[PDB]
Amino acid sequence: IHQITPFLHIPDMQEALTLFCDTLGFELKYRHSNYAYLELSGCGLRLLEEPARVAICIDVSDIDSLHTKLSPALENLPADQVEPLKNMPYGQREFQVRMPDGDWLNFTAPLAEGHHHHH
Amino acid sequence: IHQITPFLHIPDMQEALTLFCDTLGFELKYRHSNYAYLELSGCGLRLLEEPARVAICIDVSDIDSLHTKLSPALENLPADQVEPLKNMPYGQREFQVRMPDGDWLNFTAPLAEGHHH
Secondary structure, three states: EEEEEEEEOOHHHHHHHHHHHHHOOEEEEEEEEEEEEEEEEEEEEEEEEEOOOOOEEEEEHHHHHHHHHHHHOOOOOHHHHHHHOOEOOOOOEEEEEEEOOOEEEEEEEEEOOOOOOOO | EEEEEEEEEEEHHHHHHHHHHHHOEEEEEEEEEOOEEEEOOOEEEEEEEEEEEEHHHHHHHHOHHHHHHHHHHHOOOHEEEEEEEEEEOEEEEEEEEEEOOOEEEEEEEOOOOOOOO
């Protein structure tokens, strides 16, 4: 378990970057399409431009061992409040759980051997 | 800058603790009234029961030096989108900034020297 990042959904990426980067000092680390990943002294923050959604993303190593550890408990959640492990197009393996406020939580790890790794 | 914690506002504390602690593995570290602070492998997550607000809390040390460094840029933000440094009755010194999604962000730190911790 590396870090817990809020995943914000904002209307204008440039305005968001103006606040978080230029005003608050966040460093823009990675960007693809309408997605952005920032860090303030190492702590991550995810942004998605949007002119239920994922509000939290938990970065981890070996998401399979974590998923197995949590499996028995995840089996007790309403079927529509949990998603199975899935290799995503953007280079991350992840699974989802719905939170009490209605938004979703993501567990995510970069793909290991045998896959294209995005920088 | 120690961590960036999401600050969730949930319908029922017990139901939320069951999910995060019992199902996902988080540890409850402090609770008071409708507020709770948990950690997963040392990573923070804050909760508030509510049967626009702060959705992000950034835990820091020496928040006074940080405020000074951000001050010039904070001065260019709409007046109603920024709050000055202020000591809170709940043991933290914080300042706030409104985010592009309408919710707020907190920079917070426990009172330094001279205070009961």
